[PDB]
Design a protein around this ligand. Structure first.
Ligand SMILES: Nc1nc2c(ncn2[C@@H]2O[C@H](COP(=O)(O)OP(=O)(O)OP(=O)(O)O)[C@@H](O)[C@H]2O)c(=O)[nH]1
Ligand SMILES: [Mg+2]
Lengths: 431, 184, 87, 1043
C-alpha cells in the first residue's frame, strides 16, 4: 500500500483541498457518515492510498489542515463533509501573516512548524509503506508562501527518500489588488525550484479570461474557478486511485515525466469546461474531446504550447470507451496523409483509459504536459519583480523583521537562470 | 499557539511596556525618571552605558531602556523576545549643531509600515536661556511633518516657569494604553 | 470553408459617418491579417489600430483585442458579433 | 508655543465603504453573485486589521446597531437574517467573542426572542451554521442579567434551555463551543445551581462512562463533555464544586486518557485535572498528590500542547503549595534531566523551570542545579536518521535564561550570569538554526542590560544584533573573530568548534567549521599548534567518515594559518610545528590507501579532502622535496582525473577544479630543481602521460585532462609549448567520432586561454612563449569554434563552446594590447567584432547579456586603445561610458532598441541582421513581439529612401542565398519576411511592375520548399507566396501559379 499524506495550507489551499475531497468522495462512493455504499468492486481496490481503515469499516480522509487564521478552520469543519476529517489534524493560529513572507517564514511561521511536524510524524508512523506527500497552497499571501516552503524543506530533510508534489496557484492582478504579492511569489519560487519534484501551475489570469469569454460570466467569483480547479485535480489523480493498463505510481511518473530536476513545471488541462450549473449540452465524441483538451483554449495556464516544445505528454480518458478506439484515433490523427491531420497536437502522448466517468459528465479527458511555455509566466512575474525593486518600494517591510537584501537578488538570479535554461532547452531536435 | 501567544497574553495581563529613552543632554533626563519613581538620585540619574530598569506608574510596568550613545541604535529598537512601544528623545534647545545627527537618526529608525507603530515624544529642555528655539522651529528643523505612522508631540521644559510636563507624559500613556490594551 | 465563415459587422465609434458594413472572415484568421486589411481599407497606419468585439449575448461589455499572434477563435468570437475599429 | 501635538489619522479607513456595504444589504440578497462579491469584499477589509483588531474598537457600535436592526426585523426573510448572521460571525472571528458580544442586547425581555430563534434552528443545514453558532453565544450574554428566570414563567424556560444545551453539546460543527459557553454561563447562576448543576454532572458522568475512543461520535461527545466541565470549573465558585471535585477525578482516572491516541482529549484532560488541582487548594488535602503526578507524567508527552499545559499547571500549582511540597516538586522536576530521557522530557522540564522562575518560587539553593541543567540543555543534539533532533532544547534553555534574567535581581543573579554568558555567545554565533542563535542573542542582550557592569557587553551587543545574527556565514568568520579578539573568548571557541562542528553530519557545517578554525587559529598560535593539532592528527585516523572528512580540513587550514604567521617574521613552518606533526602529516594518504577507503560513495569526500590537503601543503612549502609522498599524491591526482564519470554530476566540477588546483600547486612547488628550470625526466613523463590521454574515448577523461594541462606553470612549459598547443587544437576540432563532445572542446579552449595568460609574450620564441610566430594558429582555432551549433536530445550545446571562445578571445585581445599590440590585425579584429555583434543579436537572455558585456568591455578599453576598430566613434556615441550599468541586456525591451541601431553601419549590417533574423522568427512570444516592435522603429526612417531600403533588401536576400537548405536560418528568415510583408514595409517598390527585389525573392522561395515534408516550412512558403502578390506583372501570375 503506497499511502500519500495530503497537507492543506492557506485559505485557498484549504478550500481547494476541501473541494477536491468532496469531489473524490462522491466518486469513490463514501457517504458523509463514513461507511461505503458503492455498487462496484473497482472503487475499493485502491481506497487504502488516500484513506485509512478503522473499526467498523470506516475510511478516514488522509488530509491535514494548517493555518495562522481560524476563520477557514471553522468554515470547513462545519462543512458538508467536514465531520469525516480527524479533529486532531486541525492546527491553526490567530494573528496570521498579512501578506508577508517574512511574517510567515521567520516570525510567526516558525512558532507553529514544530506543532505541524508533530501531526505529520504521528500520521506517517501508522503507514506501512509511505510513498510521498502533497501540499496545496498559493503564491499570493504570506502564510502559504512562507510556512508552506518551511514545511516542504522540513519533509525534504526528515524524509529525503520520499516524493514531494505541490499544486501552487499563481496570482493575477485581475483578481487580487495586493502590491507586495509578486515579491512573496518569487520568494516561494526560489525555494520551489530546489525543493519540489513536480509542480502544477494554475494561473488565475487564464481562468479569469476563460470565465470571462468562454463561459460568459458577468462577475466570475472564486467558486467558478475553484470548480474547474477541483475538476482538474480529480482528473489528474486518476492513475493514483484507479488501476489500468498504464501501471504507474508517483515515483514512476516523476521519473518518466521529469527528465531534468530543474525543469518540472507542468501545464494541466480539462475538457469540456462546464460551470457550476447542473446542465449538459451533448455527449461529445472522442475526436472532439481530444481536440478540445489539446487546444490552447482549455489550458489552465496563460501560455500557448504551440510556441514551445513538448517534453512529456500524458492524457487520461474517463468514460465508457475502449482502448482500441483511443489507439486507432492516436494512430489516425498522427498521419499526414489523412484529412483530419493537425499540427498543434504532439506525437509522444501516453494514453490511458479509465472506466469510472466523472460526476456529472459521461466522457471527459484530462491533459498533462510539460511544455516549455512557463517562461512566459516567469517573465511576466519578473516584469513585476523588476518594476518594483528599482524604486525599493515596500522593501523595508521585509528588512525590519530579519530578512536580508541579498535574498531578493539571489531569487532574481535564480529566476533569470531558470528562464535562460528554459529558452536553451526549448530548441532541441533529434535526427 | 506558541511562545508568542503566551508572551502577548502576559503583556496584556501584567500591562508591561517598553519605553526606549534616548538623549545626550545629561540634564533633562533626571526629571523624567523622577516622574517614574518617587526617588531623586537612586535610579534617577542617567548612565553612560546601557541599563535596564523597571518602575511602576499608573499601574503600568514601564521597562525603561536608557541608552547613552546615539549611534547604531537599531540594536535596542528590535528584540527577538520583545519590541519597543514608546520612544522619548531629549535634545537641547540652544544647540543647532547636534540636531542634524538626531534628525538623521530619527529618520533612519522610524520607518513607514502598514498599521500603527511606536509613539514618539520629543523633549525640549532649557527654554528660558537665550538662543532656544520655539516649537515651530523644532518641528521645521527635525521635519516631523513627513514622519507618518508614529504620533509625535513636542513638550517644552525649563528650570524656571517651564510650564510643567504632566500632559506630555499623560498623552504618551493614553496613546499607548489605548493601542495595545482595551479600554473595557 | 463556408461553414467556418463569421458574418460580423464593422463599426467605427470615432467616425460615425461611415456605414456599418458586414464582412465574412474565416474563423482561423489572425488579428494581424485583419489589422492589415483595415490599414489599407482606411489608409490608416496599422501601428495605431485598436480592435474590439461585442457580442449580443453580453451587452454593455467590450472585450479588447490586443495580441496579434492569436486568432479569432481563441477570443471566443462567434458568428453575429461586431468589430470595433478605433484609431 | 510649547505644547504641540502632531496631526493624527484614523486607523480604520473603510468606515464609509463599509457603511455603504452594510446599508445596501437590502438590495444584494436578491442576487447570487452580488452576495458573493459583498461577502468577499466585506471579509477582505476585515482581514486588513487582523493583526491589530484593537484599532477597530470605536467602529464596533454603529455596525452592530445596523446589523441587529436588520436581524430583529419581523418582515425580513430568513436569507437576509442568515446573511447578517454570517457578517456578525465574521466580525466575532476577527475581533473576539469576549468583548464584542458585551454589546449584544442583554435585557430580560430579549432572552425570550433570543431562545425562540434558537428552537427554530435546523441542525441539518451546512449552509447556515453561523446562525446556530452565534445564537448560543448571544443567549449566553443574556443569562448574565440578574433577574429570576421564574419571573418570566419541556414546559419551563430553564428546562428548554437545558435541553437545547444538552442537544447542542453533542453536535459535530463549531456550535459545540457555543453550547459549552452557554452551559458554563447559565448553569453557574444563583437560581439554576439548585436543581440542574448535579443533574448535569450525572449526565456528564454517564457520557464519559458510555462513550468510547473507537467510534467517531464518542470522541466528539467526550470532547464536548471535557470542554463543558473545564469551563464550568473555571467560571465557578469554590464552595459549589467542592462537594463534587473528587467524583470527577475518580471518573476521569478510569477513562485512561494518557493511554490513547487523541491529542485534543489528552490536552483537555490535562487542563481539567490542572483546574481541579487549582480548585482543591485554598486561594495537602487528599487527591492533590495524584493531580501533581498526572501533571508531571504529562510534562513528558510527545506533543507540545500537552507539555505546555502541564508546565502551566505546575507553575500555577507551585504557588498554592507549602514550602516543603514546593521544594519537593522543584526537586522532582529538576531530576527529570537524565541521560535515559528523550528530548520531550527535557523540553518539559525546561518549560516547568521557566514557569517556576517566572513567578519567583525557586529557592536559591536550587540555582546550583539550575546552572548545571542549563549548561546541559544548551548543548543537546542527538543523531537520529539523516539529520538530528533536539533543536527545541536550546530555545527552551534560552527562554529559561531570559526569564531568570528578567526575574531575579542583578545582585541575586550575579554568579549565574558569569557562568552562562560564555555558553550563550557561543551558540549565538555558531548554532546551525537562526532562531537558536537569535534567541541566545536576545538573552545575552537582556543579561548585559540588566547586570549593568559587564565587560565588552556593548562591544559585542552592537557588533552582533537581532539582524546581524541573520547572516550565518559571517557568524562563523566575521563576528566570531571579533568576539574571539578578547582573551576570555578565544580558547573555549576553538575547543568547542573542533569538538562539535568539524564532524557535524552536514558537509556545509563542516566546511564552515574548518573556515572558522583557520580564521581563529591566528588569534591563538601557540595553543592551536600544540594542543589542537595533536587532536586533529588523532582524529584523522577515526572510523567515522565525516569526522575524517572534517579533521583533514582543520589540519590543512591551521597549517596554512601558521605558515602565514611565520612568513611575516620570515621563518619556515618548521618553527611552530614540531617533527611529530611532520611525521603525522606524511602518513595520511598512505594510511587512507592501505585501507582502501576511496571506494564506494563515501570515497568522494576523502578524495575531495585529500586534494584540499595537498593544495594547502603545497603552498606551505613543506620539506618533502624528493619523497614517495609526492609520487603518491601525483598518482592519486591522476586517478582522480581519470575516474570522473563514476562520480555524480552534482559533485563532479568541484572535484575536477580541486584536482586541477592541487596539481598546479604541486607542479609549481615540488617540481623545480633550479630557479627557472625543471627536472627533464619528470616533465617529459608528465607531458607524455598528458598528451596520450587526449584521444581517450571517454569525454570526462578529456575534460579533466584539458583543465589539468591548462594549469601548468610558465617554467614547466619551456620548449614544449608547441606540442601542447597542437594537442589542445586537435581536441577543440570535431569529427564523426566526437560530434556531441561539446564540453571537451570548451575545456580545451579555456586551457588554451589559461596557458596564454600564464606563459606570456616574448619576442622571438614560438616554442617558449606566444608571439607572432604562433598567434594566428590560436586566433583561427578560437574563431573556428564560434560556428558551433550542435543540437542533440539535451538541447543547444553550442552556447557552452561559444561563451568559452568569446572569453578566450577577450582574455587574448587585451593581452596583445599590453604585449606587442602590433600583432593585432585589422581583418581578424573586424571579424571578431562582427562575431561578437552576431552573438549579441541572439535570442537567449543570458547569452545576449554576456555577449553585450564582452562587447562593452573591449569597446571601453582605452589603455591602450585597441586599434583597427570599425566605426569606433559611432559605437562610442551610441554606447556612452555612463550607460553601461543603466542598460539591462537581460530584458529584450531594454536591448533590442539598442541593438537594431547597428543596422545603420555598412560594416555590421550583415552579422547584426543575420542574428536578428533568428530572434524575429524564433519561438518565444515576448521576444518575437519585442523584436517586431523594435524593427519598425528603425524601418520607419528608411522606408521613403529607396537606396537605404534597397541596400537592406539586398543584404537580406544575400543572407537568404548564403543560408540555403538550412532549416535553422531559412525558416526564421521566412517568418521575418511574413511578419514584414504584412506591415507594408516594402511599398515604395509596388509602384513599378516586376521590381528587381521580388523577382529574386520569389525565385529563392521556389527552391526552399521543393519536394519537402516539413509542415512549418510549407506554411511559411504558403504565407510568403500569399503575401508576395502585391507586386503586379509576371510576379503576380507566378505567385498565382505557385499557389
Ligand atoms: N483560485 C483561488 N485563488 C484564491 C482563493 N482564495 C484566495 N485566492 C488567492 O490567493 C491569494 C491570496 O492568498 P491567501 O489565500 O489570502 O493567503 P494566506 O496565506 O491565507 O494569507 P495571509 O496569511 O493573510 O498572508 C490571492 O491571489 C487570491 O486571489 C480561492 O478560493 N481560489
Ligand atoms: Mg489568509
Amino acid at each position: 500500500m503506497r499511502e500519500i499524506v495530503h497537507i492543506q495550507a492557506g485559505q485557498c489551499g484549504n478550500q481547494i483541498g476541501a473541494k477536491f475531497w468532496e469531489v473524490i468522495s462522491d466518486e469513490h462512493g463514501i457517504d458523509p457518515t463514513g461507511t461505503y455504499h458503492g455498487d462496484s468492486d473497482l472503487q475499493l481496490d485502491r481506497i487504502s492510498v488516500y484513506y485509512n481503515e478503522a473499526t467498523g469499516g470506516k475510511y478516514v480522509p488522509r488530509a491535514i489542515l494548517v493555518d495562522l487564521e481560524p476563520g477557514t478552520m471553522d468554515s470547513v469543519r462545519s462543512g458538508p463533509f467536514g465531520q469525516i476529517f480527524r479533529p486532531d489534524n486541525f492546527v491553526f493560529g490567530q494573528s496570521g501573516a498579512g501578506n508577508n513572507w517574512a511574517k510567515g517564514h521567520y516570525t510567526e511561521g516558525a512558532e507553529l512548524v514544530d506543532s505541524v511536524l508533530d501531526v505529520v510524524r504521528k500520521e506517517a508512523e501508522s503507514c506501512d509503506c509511505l510513498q510521498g506527500f502533497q501540499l496545496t497552497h498559493s503564491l499570493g499571501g504570506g502564510t502559504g508562501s512562507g510556512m508552506g516552503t518551511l514545511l516542504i524543506s522540513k519533509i525534504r530533510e526528515e524524509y529525503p527518500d520520499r516524493i514531494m508534489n505541490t499544486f501552487s496557484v499563481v496570482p493575477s492582478p485581475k483578481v487580487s489588488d495586493t502590491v507586495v504579492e509578486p515579491y512573496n511569489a518569487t520568494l516561494s519560487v526560489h525555494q520551489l525550484v530546489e525543493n519540489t519534484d513536480e509542480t502544477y501551475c494554475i494561473d488565475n489570469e487564464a481562468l479569469y479570461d476563460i470565465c470571462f469569454r468562454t463561459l460568459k460570466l458577468t462577475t466570475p467569483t472564486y467558486g467558478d474557478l475553484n470548480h474547474l480547479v477541483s475538476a482538474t485535480m480529480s482528473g489528474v489523480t486518476t492513475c493514483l486511485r484507479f488501476p489500468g493498463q498504464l501501471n504507474a505510481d508517483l515515483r514512476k511518473l516523476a521519473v518518466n515525466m521529469v527528465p531534468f530536476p530543474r525543469l518540472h513545471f507542468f501545464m494541466p488541462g480539462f475538457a469540456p469546461l462546464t460551470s457550476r450549473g447542473s446542465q449538459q449540452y451533448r455527449a461529445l465524441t472522442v475526436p472532439e474531446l481530444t481536440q478540445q483538451v489539446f487546444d490552447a483554449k482549455n489550458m489552465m495556464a496563460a501560455c500557448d504550447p504551440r510556441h514551445g516544445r513538448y517534453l512529456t505528454v500524458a492524457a487520461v480518458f474517463r468514460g465508457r470507451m475502449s482502448m482500441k478506439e483511443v489507439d486507432e484515433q492516436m494512430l489516425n490523427v498522427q498521419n499526414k496523409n489523412s484529412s483530419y491531420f493537425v499540427e498543434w497536437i504532439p506525437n509522444n502522448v501516453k494514453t490511458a483509459v479509465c472506466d469510472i466517468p466523472p460526476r456529472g459528465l459521461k466522457m471527459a479527458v484530462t491533459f498533462i504536459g510539460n511544455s516549455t511555455a512557463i517562461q512566459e509566466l516567469f517573465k511576466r512575474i519578473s516584469e513585476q519583480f523588476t518594476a518594483m525593486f528599482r524604486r525599493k518600494a515596500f522593501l523595508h517591510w521585509y528588512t525590519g523583521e530579519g530578512m536580508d537584501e541579498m535574498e531578493f537578488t539571489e531569487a532574481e538570479s535564480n529566476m533569470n537562470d531558470l528562464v535562460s535554461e528554459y529558452q536553451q532547452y526549448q530548441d532541441a531536435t533529434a535526427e | 499557539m506558541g511562545l508568542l501567544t503566551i508572551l502577548k497574553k502576559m503583556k496584556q495581563k501584567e500591562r508591561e511596556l517598553r519605553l526606549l529613552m534616548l538623549g545626550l543632554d545629561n540634564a533633562g533626563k533626571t526629571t523624567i525618571l523622577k516622574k517614574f519613581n518617587g526617588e531623586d538620585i537612586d535610579t534617577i540619574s542617567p548612565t553612560l552605558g546601557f541599563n535596564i530598569k523597571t518602575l511602576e506608574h499608573r499601574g503600568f510596568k514601564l521597562n525603561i531602556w536608557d541608552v547613552g550613545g546615539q549611534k547604531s541604535l537599531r540594536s535596542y529598537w528590535r528584540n527577538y523576545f520583545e519590541s519597543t512601544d514608546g520612544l522619548i528623545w531629549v535634545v537641547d534647545s540652544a544647540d543647532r549643531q547636534r540636531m542634524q545627527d538626531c534628525q538623521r537618526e530619527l529618520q533612519s529608525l522610524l520607518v513607514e509600515e502598514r498599521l500603527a507603530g511606536a509613539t514618539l515624544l520629543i523633549f525640549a529642555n532649557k527654554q528660558d536661556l537665550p538662543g532656544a528655539l520655539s516649537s515651530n522651529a523644532i518641528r521645521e528643523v527635525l521635519e516631523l511633518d513627513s514622519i507618518r505612522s508614529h504620533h509625535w508631540c513636542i513638550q517644552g521644559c525649563s528650570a524656571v516657569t517651564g510650564e510643567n510636563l504632566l500632559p506630555g507624559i499623560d498623552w504618551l500613556l493614553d496613546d499607548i494604553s489605548s493601542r495595545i490594551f482595551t479600554a473595557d | 470553408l463556408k461553414n467556418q465563415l463569421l458574418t460580423l459587422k464593422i463599426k467605427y465609434p470615432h467616425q460615425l459617418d461611415q456605414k456599418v458594413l458586414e464582412k465574412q472572415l474565416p474563423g482561423s484568421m489572425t488579428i494581424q491579417k485583419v489589422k492589415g486589411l483595415l490599414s489599407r481599407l482606411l489608409k490608416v497606419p496599422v501601428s495605431d489600430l485598436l480592435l474590439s468585439y461585442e457580442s449580443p449575448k453580453k451587452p454593455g461589455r467590450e472585450i479588447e483585442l490586443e495580441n496579434d499572434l492569436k486568432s479569432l477563435q481563441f477570443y471566443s468570437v462567434e458568428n453575429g458579433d461586431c468589430l470595433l475599429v478605433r484609431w | 508655543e510649547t505644547l504641540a501635538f502632531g496631526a493624527a489619522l484614523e486607523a480604520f479607513g473603510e468606515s464609509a465603504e463599509t457603511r455603504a456595504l452594510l446599508g445596501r444589504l437590502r438590495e444584494v440578497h436578491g442576487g447570487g453573485a452580488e452576495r458573493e462579491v459583498a461577502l468577499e469584499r466585506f471579509r477582505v477589509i476585515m482581514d486588513k486589521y487582523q493583526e491589530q483588531p484593537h484599532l477597530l474598537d470605536p467602529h464596533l457600535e454603529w455596525m452592530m446597531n445596523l446589523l441587529l436592526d436588520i436581524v430583529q426585523d419581523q418582515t425580513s426573510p430568513a436569507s437576509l437574517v442568515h446573511l447578517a448572521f454570517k457578517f456578525l460571525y465574521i466580525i466575532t472571528k476577527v475581533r473576539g467573542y469576549k468583548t464584542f458580544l458585551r454589546l449584544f442586547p442583554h435585557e430580560v425581555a430579549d432572552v425570550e426572542p433570543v431562545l425562540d430563534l434558537v428552537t427554530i434552528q435546523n441542525p441539518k443545514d451546512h449552509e447556515a451554521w453561523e446562525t446556530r453558532y452565534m445564537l448560543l453565544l448571544w443567549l449566553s450574554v443574556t443569562c448574565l442579567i440578574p433577574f429570576d428566570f421564574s419571573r418570566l414563567d419541556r414546559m419551563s424556560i430553564m428546562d428548554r434551555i437545558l435541553q437545547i444545551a444538552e442537544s447542542y453539546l453533542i453536535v459535530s460543527d463549531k456550535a459545540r463551543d457555543a453550547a459549552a459557553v452557554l452551559v458554563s454561563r447559565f448553569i453557574t447562576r444563583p437560581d439554576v445551581k439548585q436543581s440542574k448543576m448535579a443533574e448535569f454532572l450525572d449526565w456528564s458522568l454517564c457520557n464519559l462512562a458510555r462513550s468510547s475512543f473507537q467510534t467517531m461520535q464518542g470522541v466528539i461527545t467526550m470532547d464536548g463533555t471535557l470542554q463543558a466541565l473545564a469551563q464550568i470549573f473555571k467560571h465557578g465558585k469554590r464552595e459549589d464544586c467542592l462537594p463534587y471535585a473528587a467524583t470527577v477525578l475518580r471518573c476521569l482516572d478510569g477513562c485512561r486518557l494518557p493511554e490513547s491516541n487523541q491529542t485534543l482529549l489528552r490536552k483537555l484532560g490535562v487542563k481539567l485535572v490542572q483546574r481541579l488541582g487549582l480548585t482543591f487548594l485554598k486561594p495537602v488535602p487528599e487527591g492533590v498528590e495524584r493531580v501533581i503526578e498526572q501533571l508531571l507524567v504529562g510534562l513528558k508527552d510527545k506533543d507540545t500542547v500537552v507539555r505546555w499545559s502541564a508546565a502551566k499547571g505546575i507553575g500555577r500549582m507551585a504557588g498554592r503549595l507549602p514550602r516543603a511540597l514546593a521544594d519537593d516538586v522543584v526537586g522532582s522536576v529538576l531530576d527529570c534531566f537524565s541521560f535515559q530521557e528523550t528530548d520531550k522530557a527535557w523540553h518539559g522540564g525546561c518549560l516547568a523551570l521557566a514557569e517556576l522562575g517566572r513567578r519567583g518560587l525557586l529557592l536559591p539553593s536550587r540555582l546550583v542545579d539550575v546552572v548545571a541543567v542549563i549548561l546541559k540543555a544548551l548543548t543537546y543534539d542527538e543523531k537520529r536518521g539523516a539529520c538530528s533532533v533536539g533543536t527545541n532544547v536550546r530555545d527552551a534553555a534560552c527562554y529559561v535564561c531570559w526569564a531568570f534574567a528578567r526575574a531575579y535581581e542583578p545582585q541575586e543573579l550575579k554568579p549565574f550570569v558569569t557562568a552562562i554568558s560564555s555558553a550563550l555567545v557561543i551558540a549565538a554565533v555558531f548554532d546551525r538554526d537562526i532562531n537558536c542563535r537569535r534567541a541566545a542573542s536576545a538573552a545575552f542582550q537582556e543579561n548585559v542590560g540588566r547586570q549593568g557592569t559587564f565587560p565588552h557587553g556593548i562591544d559585542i551587543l552592537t557588533t552582533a544584533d537581532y539582524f546581524a545574527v541573520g547572516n550565518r556565514s559571517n557568524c562563523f568568520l566575521v563576528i566570531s573573530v571579533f568576539i574571539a579578539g578578547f582573551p576570555e573568548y578565544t580558547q573555549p571557541m576553538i575547543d568547542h568548534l573542533v569538538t562539535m562542528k568539524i564532524s557535524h553530519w552536514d558537509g556545509v557545517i563542516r566546511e564552515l567549521a574548518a573556515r572558522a578554525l583557520h580564521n581563529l587559529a591566528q588569534q591563538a598560535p601557540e595553543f592551536s599548534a600544540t594542543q589542537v593539532f595533536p587532536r586533529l592528527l588523532s582524529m584523522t585516523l577515526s572510523p567515522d567518515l565525516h569526522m575524517r572528512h572534517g579533521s583533514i580540513l582543520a589540519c590543512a587550514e591551521v597549517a596554512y594559518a601558521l605558515y602565514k604567521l611565520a612568513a611575516q617574521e620570515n621563518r619556515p613552518v618548521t618553527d611552530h610545528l614540531d617533527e611529530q606533526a611532520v611525521q603525522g602529516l606524511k602518513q595520511i594518504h598512505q594510511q587512507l590507501y592501505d585501507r582502501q577507503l576511496y571506494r564506494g560513495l563515501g570515497g568522494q569526500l576523502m578524495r575531495q579532502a585529500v586534494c584540499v590537503l595537498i593544495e594547502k601543503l603545497s603552498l606551505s612549502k613543506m620539506p618533502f622535496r624528493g619523497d614517495t609522498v609526492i609520487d603518491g599524491w601525483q598518482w592519486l591526482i591522476n586517478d582522480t582525473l581519470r575516474h570522473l564519470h563514476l562520480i555524480s554530476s552534482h559533485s563532479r566540477q568541484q572535484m575536477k577544479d580541486a584536482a586541477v588546483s592541487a596539481l598546479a600547486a604541486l607542479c609549481s612547488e615540488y617540481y623545480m630543481k633550479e630557479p627557472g628550470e625543471a627536472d627533464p625526466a619528470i616533465q617529459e613523463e608528465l607531458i607524455t602521460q598528458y598528451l596520450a590521454e587526449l584521444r581517450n574515448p571517454e569525454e570526462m577523461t578529456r575534460c579533466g585532462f584539458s583543465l589539468a594541462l591548462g594549469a601548468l606553470p610558465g617554467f614547466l612549459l619551456k620548449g614544449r609549448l608547441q606540442q601542447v598547443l597542437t594537442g589542445l587544437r586537435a581536441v577543440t576540432h570535431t569529427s564523426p567520432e566526437d560530434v556531441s563532445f561539446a564540453e571537451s572542446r570548451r575545456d580545451g579552449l579555456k586551457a588554451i586561454a589559461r596557458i596564454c595568460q600564464t606563459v606570456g609574450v616574448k619576442a622571438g620564441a614560438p616554442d617558449e612563449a606566444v608571439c607572432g610566430e604562433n598567434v594566428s594558429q590560436i586566433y583561427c582555432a578560437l574563431l573556428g569554434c564560434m560556428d558551433d551549433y550542435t543540437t542533440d536530445s539535451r538541447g543547444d550545446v553550442g552556447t557552452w563552446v561559444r561563451k568559452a571562445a568569446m572569453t578566450s578571445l577577450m582574455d587574448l585581445t587585451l593581452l596583445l594590447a599590453r604585449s606587442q599590440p602590433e600583432l593585432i590585425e585589422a581583418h581578424t579584429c573586424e571579424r571578431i567584432m562582427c562575431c561578437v555583434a552576431q552573438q549579441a543579436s541572439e535570442k537567449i537572455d543570458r547569452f545576449r547579456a554576456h555577449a553585450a558585456s564582452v562587447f562593452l568591455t573591449l569597446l571601453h578599453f582605452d589603455s591602450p586603445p585597441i586599434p583597427h576598430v570599425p566605426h569606433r566613434g559611432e559605437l562610442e556615441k551610441l554606447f556612452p561610458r555612463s550607460d553601461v550599468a543603466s542598460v539591462n541586456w537581460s530584458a529584450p525591451s531594454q536591448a533590442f532598441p539598442r541593438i537594431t541601431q547597428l543596422l545603420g553601419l555598412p560594416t555590421y549590417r550583415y552579422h547584426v541582421l543575420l542574428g536578428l533574423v533568428v530572434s524575429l522568427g524564433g519561438l518565444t512570444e515576448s521576444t518575437i513581439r519585442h523584436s517586431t516592435q523594435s524593427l519598425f522603429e528603425y524601418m520607419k526612417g528608411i522606408q521613403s529612401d529607396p537606396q537605404a531600403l534597397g541596400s537592406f533588401s539586398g543584404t537580406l536576400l544575400q543572407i537568404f542565398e548564403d543560408n540555403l537548405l538550412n532549416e535553422r536560418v531559412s525558416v526564421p528568415l521566412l517568418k521575418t519576411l511574413d511578419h514584414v510583408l504584412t506591415h507594408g514595409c516594402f511599398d515604395i517598390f509596388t509602384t513599378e511592375e516586376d521590381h528587381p527585389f521580388a523577382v529574386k525573392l520569389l525565385a529563392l522561395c521556389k527552391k526552399e520548399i521543393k519536394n519537402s515534408k516539413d509542415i512549418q516550412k510549407l506554411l511559411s512558403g504558403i504565407a510568403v507566396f500569399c503575401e508576395m502578390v502585391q507586386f503586379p506583372g509576371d510576379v503576380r501570375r507566378q505567385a498565382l501559379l505557385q499557389l
